[PDB]
Write a protein that binds this DNA or RNA. Structure first.
Ligand code: CL
Ligand code: CL
Ligand code: K
Ligand code: K
Ligand code: K
Ligand code: K
Ligand code: K
Ligand code: K
Ligand code: MG
Ligand code: MG
Ligand code: MG
Ligand code: MG
Ligand code: MG
Ligand code: MG
Lengths: 404, 404
DNA sequence: ATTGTGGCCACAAT
DNA sequence: ATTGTGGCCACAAT
DNA sequence: ATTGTGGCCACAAT
DNA sequence: ATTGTGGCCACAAT
């Protein structure tokens, strides 16, 4: 069935990390990132460490041979103390020398230091953190293998995409919703994807109170569609799907009404086709269950509007991590309705196979999973007082997966 | 997998009515009923009717050739008016001539007449009603075929039993619970089954108010176990299962406590083994759902105590009629627990294939289905003021399936 | 912060 | 007394 | 009351 | 305007 497309027109089966890695070695990734400096900084507090040298050697050989990113050099910067100012001084030194990305090794668990540095780096340059105490207790081959999937993605590469039928499913899918920081505060998100799983544009609102949810939900979605349309001016959106998720205020009927108005306003503004066909879906992870005795791709109808996708967890007991899918609004005709239901459910299943955090599928649609990654950063940068992250006006933050 | 055992040691596959009927013709039913008079009365208001003659001819040939009940004669009794007294006069005339059962043809839908006559007959002799206006608009072959399954069962025959492994599952299963007549009144039931699906003994309480539920639940169960033990004095019950069902008062923790006490008291009275292993299960029909794309026998674990059986309903859309199964109490050890879970769930699935109302399986466990049939009669005999039905003291009502 | 899952066991909840 | 949760830790993944 | 399921369509609910 | 329910009726089952 489903396969991943990598470089040189090649495709590999899903659910098979060994063949995916061998495929990258033979054919390269779907897109090799183009870089300005062809230079990466490795920033650490372990000068002359054997492990650092082994780590550097695996990184340099896999970037060249697996990712096909040629002529890269790694420069080292040593910080003298595990504190914000000392590390930041080396980050700034690396940026001053001219680098495309920073790999930053921290000595231990340190939530405030990590989120202060991470928010600074996300606002500056693609970056990848590492924990020396963890790295020193891992199979280094598996560690670096998965590390590079997400670092190459942060550099703007595309490791692999979904091989999907171009005539089925949505022109774009917008993952949208809000995530709660606490009982009162939240932020809205809206992330535009192609049906092949690649993210085109992402927007998040400022942190606001629950009372401001519906205003900022509409404005955040409008902003992401504007950004998508400016960066993809020749994209005609004739089939549009919203995936709504996140722990957010319980205003279901009011929320659906606002989301419908938003699509209608975007139609009037000619940001999507005047004849766009669209559906607004709620995607909810529900309680896991176990088949005690082929649910890969299975679709369950609970009512005309309510469905369940039996996603496998990533005693002949088969673990299922089901996904609730509710159609809360659509402009489909009765004659096309069930055809479209099948297509949107298949689409959600294909999107569940897209994950650039590592080689192994998360078995969770990227339209739900990537906002969760974003929420983890925004919440903790707020909690530990780092540098605010707002992608507006910042093309790198609007188009690259800095949340991986 | 599962098969039905019929006469002469033969067995036929489940889910295949054509082979079940051919099997009865070749080998007979599992048990042919022994009768006193070898005489059935056909009571109707259509003397010299061609249809009545066709009906009589099919009945007489199928009783002999399909059911292997030999030397039966059918006598006719004509009532002159479709009213209780006129029909009852012919019922009494038939009983006076000496008959094993009565087949009674009514002209049309008539709920008060039907339940007054039915309650009289259930208190007198095995009986089978028919509607002339329906019979005159049916394939007579299919009509009589299924008619005789339940009439032979009412005469004490055993059409077929489940072929189950004698070393797996319960020694007896007690279907118990209560059914509401209305918001205030209810009656309790308790029905003892073998694991092959055959009913050994059944008891129902008088109609009482909800305030008296737990008292009569305990007494009704005790009464059915006493009756079972007197009629099966050599039965050792070392493995016991309760299937609790019915719309009844929401007293879940109080009900479970009473059911546990009841088993313990029966242990102390040596009505079951002192070392009996038992479980008390709640069986609930839940909302149907449809697989849009092998659930025959599939078991789903929701928690250590909560399960779902995906029973098939009796667009490649597969209809499921799931059955919730909750273990509310058991004395199993941790080492035997999941082995026993599998056995009780398989058992419930096998019991879902037992139905003597007709040839086609109801796909609902007989421990739930037969109490529902009983509830329909008791409620309506109360509502339309027929003759109360209380099986206590009446061996025919305690041991035969008069509710089919 | 490469990421995960799963066993253990103290403890909370009832 | 029984059931469920959470926090460390071991270790798997190709 | 052999029993079922499924289509239709009026109507209730919102 | 849309969604779901219920009551007749056609008809299937081997
Ligand atoms: Cl349906
Ligand atoms: Cl489990
Ligand atoms: K370049
Ligand atoms: K440089
Ligand atoms: K759902
Ligand atoms: K006899
Ligand atoms: K006689
Ligand atoms: K259950
Ligand atoms: Mg608002
Ligand atoms: Mg369709
Ligand atoms: Mg990451
Ligand atoms: Mg009581
Ligand atoms: Mg076991
Ligand atoms: Mg009947």
């Amino acid at each position: 069935g489903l396969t991943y497309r990598i470089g040189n027109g090649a495709s590999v089966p899903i659910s098979n990390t060994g063949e995916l890695i061998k495929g990258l070695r033979n054919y390269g990734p779907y897109e090799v990132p183009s870089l300005k400096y062809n230079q990466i900084a490795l920033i650490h507090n372990n000068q002359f460490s054997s492990l650092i040298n082994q780590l550097k050697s695996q990184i340099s050989s896999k970037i060249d041979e697996v990712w096909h990113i040629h002529n890269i050099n790694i420069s080292e910067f040593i910080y003298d103390s595990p504190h914000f100012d000392s590390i930041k001084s080396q980050v700034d030194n690396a940026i001053d020398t001219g680098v495309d990305g920073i790999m930053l090794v921290l000595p231990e668990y340190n939530t405030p230091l990590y989120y202060k540095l991470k928010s600074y780096l996300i606002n500056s340059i693609p970056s990848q953190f590492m924990r020396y105490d963890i790295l020193s207790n891992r199979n280094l081959t598996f560690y670096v293998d998965n590390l590079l999937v997400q670092f190459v993605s942060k550099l703007g590469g595309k490791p692999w995409i979904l091989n999907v039928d171009p005539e089925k499913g949505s022109d774009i899918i917008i993952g949208t919703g809000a995530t709660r920081i606490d009982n009162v505060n939240l932020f809205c998100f809206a992330m535009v994807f192609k049906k092949d799983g690649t993210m085109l544009w992402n927007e998040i609102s400022p942190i606001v109170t629950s009372s401001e949810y519906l205003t900022y939900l509409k404005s955040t979605i409008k902003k992401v569609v504007y950004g998508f349309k400016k960066s993809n001016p020749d994209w005609d959106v004739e089939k549009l799907t919203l995936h709504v998720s996140g722990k957010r205020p319980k205003m279901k009927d009011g929320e659906t009404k606002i989301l419908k108005e938003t699509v209608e306003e975007l139609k009037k503004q000619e940001m999507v086709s005047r004849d766009v066909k669209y559906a607004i879906l709620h995607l909810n992870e529900t309680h896991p269950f176990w088949v005690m005795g082929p649910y890969e791709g299975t679709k369950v109808k609970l009512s005309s509007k309510r469905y369940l996708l039996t996603l496998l967890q990533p005693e002949m007991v088969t673990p299922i991590k089901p996904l609730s899918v509710e159609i809360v609004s659509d402009n489909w005709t009765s004659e096309e309705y069930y055809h479209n239901v099948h297509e949107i459910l298949d689409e959600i299943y294909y999107l569940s196979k897209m994950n650039w955090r590592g080689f192994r599928s998360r078995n969770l649609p990227v339209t739900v999973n990537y906002p969760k990654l974003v929420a983890g950063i925004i919440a903790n940068v707020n909690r530990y007082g780092g540098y605010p992250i707002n992608p507006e006006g910042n093309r790198s933050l609007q188009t690259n997966p800095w949340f991986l």
